Amino acid sequence: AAQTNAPWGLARISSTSPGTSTYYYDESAGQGSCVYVIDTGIEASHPEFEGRAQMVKTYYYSSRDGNGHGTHCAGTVGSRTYGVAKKTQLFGVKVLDDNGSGQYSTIIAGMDFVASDKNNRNCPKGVVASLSLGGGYSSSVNSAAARLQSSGVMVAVAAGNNNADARNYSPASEPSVCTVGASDRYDRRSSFSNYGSVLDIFGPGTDILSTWIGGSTRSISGTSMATPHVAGLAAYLMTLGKTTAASACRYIADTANKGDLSNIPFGTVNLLAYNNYQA
């Protein structure tokens, strides 16, 4: 399948070179997989989700996304126009308030919720969790991310926006999950993206168009935006049978475009997520 005039980041993950605008992908499009977006919520009524998104948990007075960040990330995972895995099932877990903030205890509870809740959902091809959030190092936060991965969920986490070594942020610094840095449309490391040996992969993160609240769209930047590209890619690859939740991060790294990014500090992987699709 081919989607013309796609957002640059979708084109980039389906390509060996920058500068094109068509997203190429297998029509299965992540059907039968599930992705949990652990964030500010998801505006499930947005036409772009086509009834495939549901809020399943909140730790606040409402499950509504009053911010937009979570709706944007979910759109990159699985919206019809802006999403990597256009037929996946999206589940929203609101651990961040409408200002985008959250206590670590609430974030931890949200991760352990997903480890259990996946047993309440139909996800024959596998389960992914996308965590476009973080803060300073916390062993408890890292442990929660490791538990979620161990339970059989592919965990993708943002590296952080501190232009610093991600080893000092959580859950970015947990070795067993998939830590995602950000790149721009010219294959530069995004200027804010954290780096370091704990990164596993880069994805598109500068000027990413996706869904927003009020049935709208907008383009924003962050490692928060790169993470759902990798989460959606994992769901897509799991539906195709190419990998599993336990192995997807390594599979993505093994099949990535190698050595094509610029301003990669020494010691950080030079790997850009790639779906390896040949129509």
Instruction: Name the residues annotated as catalytic.
Output: 39, 69, 224
Query: Are 25 and 11 in contact, with CB atoms under 8 Å apart?
Result: no
**Is 65 a known ligand-binding residue?**
no
User: Cβ closer to Ca ion: 182 or 201?
Assistant: 201
- Near Ca ion by CB under 5 A: residue from 29, 128, 249, 252: 249
Residue 140 tokens read as 């408890």
Here's the x/- map for Ca ion, 207-246, by CB under 5 A: it reads as ----------------------------------------
265 is in an annotated binding site: no
CB of 177 to Ca ion, least distance (A): 6
Q: To the nearest whole angstrom, how small is the minimum distance from the Cβ of residue 169 to Ca ion?
A: 15
22 is in an annotated binding site: no
Candidates 31-39, 124-132, 196-204, 256-264 — which segment interacts with Ca ion by CB under 5 A? 196-204
Stretch that binds Ca ion, among 26-34, 119-127, 198-206, 269-277 (CB under 5 A): 198-206
Q: 177 among the known binding-site residues?
A: yes
- Does 145 sit near Ca ion (CB under 5 A)? no
Question: What phi-psi label fits residue 165: left (phi over 0), alpha (psi between -120 and 50 degrees) or beta?
Answer: beta
Span from 5-13, 195-203, 226-234, 256-264 in contact with Ca ion (CB under 5 A): 195-203
Closer CB to Ca ion, 218 or 250, in the complex: 250
Query: Looking at beta carbons only, is 38 or 209 nearer to Ca ion?
Result: 38
- State which residue, 43 or 200, has the beta carbon closest to Ca ion: 200
Question: Least distance in Å: CB of 200 to Ca ion?
Answer: 5
Minimum distance from residue 155 beta carbon to Ca ion (Å): 9
Tell whether residue 207 is among the known ligand binding residues.
Answer: no
Interface region with Ca ion, contact rule CB under 5 A, candidates 60-68, 134-142, 199-207, 233-241: 199-207
What is the closest distance, in whole angstroms, from the C-beta atom of residue 113 to Ca ion in the complex? 22
In the chain, the amino acid numbered 198 is: V
What DSSP assignment string belongs to the chain? -EETT--HHHHHHT-SSSS---EE--TTTTTTEEEEEEES---TT-GGGTT-EEEEEESSS--S-SSSHHHHHHHHHH-TTT-SSTT-EEEEEE-S-TTS---HHHHHHHHHHHHHHGGGS--TTEEEEEE---EE--HHHHHHHHHHHHTT-EEEEE--SSSSBGGGEETTT-TTSEEEEEE-TTSBBPTT--BSTT--EEEE-SSEEEEETTTEEEEE-SHHHHHHHHHHHHHHHHHTTS--TTTHHHHHHHTSEES--BS--TTS--EE-------
Pick from 33, 13, 3, 5: nearest CA to 230: 13
Please report, as ranges, the residues that interact with Ca ion according to CB under 5 A: 200, 249
